[PDB]
């Protein structure tokens, strides 16, 4: 398929997700989620993310250590509207920010975003530059997925690698 990933069983939670020439595209006003069947504890997880025209030109995100309905877990995003990389958590569907890094995020520019999750430590890299290195102990394991917020965004080369504890 046109979506390149080393993970399978991608199943929509909500929103509109479709594979395009450019990868897997999500589009929603508000938040939307798709989850892979794959789970992980400690890992690297990464994607190319491009925010397209449309909606609110908001955010595209990696989601990880997620429960099955994406109401609990962690996200690392690129947010064109607010020029941020944000690391945050959903708990019972409510978001709380763990750390964020203000940096220009423009529409129609490909970004690479990578998270290294080891124990309760999370390192997040934008275009291979470490931008957040923070701790949170709420969730230790769960599913991988993707999200978009007030945006159309496309994800390509979505890969994970499990790490030893």
Commentary on this structure:
Helix content is 0%, strand content 67%. The protein is an all-beta fold and 165 residues long. The chain has one domain (1-165): Jelly Rolls (Sandwich), CATH 2.60.120. Strands 1, 2, 3, 4, 5, 6, 7, 8, 9, 10, 11 and 12 form a twelve-stranded antiparallel beta sheet that branches. Strand 7 and strand 8 form a beta hairpin. The protein is globular, with a radius of gyration of 14 Å. Belongs to the glycosyl hydrolase 32 family. It is found in: Secreted. This is Levanase.
Summarize the entry for a quick read.
By secondary structure, this protein is an all-beta fold.
| Named CATH architecture | Sandwich
Run of helices and strands: EEEEEEEEEEEE
Task: Give the DSSP E fraction (strand runs of 2 or more residues).
Answer: over 45%
First-to-last CA distance: 33 Å
Topology-level CATH name = Jelly Rolls
The total beta strand count reads 12
Helical run tally:
0
Computed structural class: mainly beta
Instruction: Profile the largest sheet.
Output: 12 strands, antiparallel
Structural domains: how many: 1
Question: What is the C-alpha radius of gyration, as a whole number of Å?
Answer: 14 Å
Q: Sum up the overall morphology in one term.
A: globular
CATH class: Mainly Beta
CATH homologous superfamily label: Exo-inulinase, domain 1
Helix percentage: under 10%
Per-chain topology:
Blueprint: E1 11-14, E2 16-20, E3 23-40, E4 43-51, E5 59-66, E6 73-79, E7 84-91, E8 94-102, E9 110-118, E10 121-126, E11 129-135, E12 142-162
Antiparallel strand pairs: 1-3, 2-3, 3-12, 4-9, 4-12, 5-6, 5-12, 6-7, 7-8, 9-10, 10-11
Subcellular location: Secreted
Keywords: Carbohydrate metabolism, Glycosidase, Hydrolase, Secreted, Signal
Organism: Bacillus subtilis (strain 168)
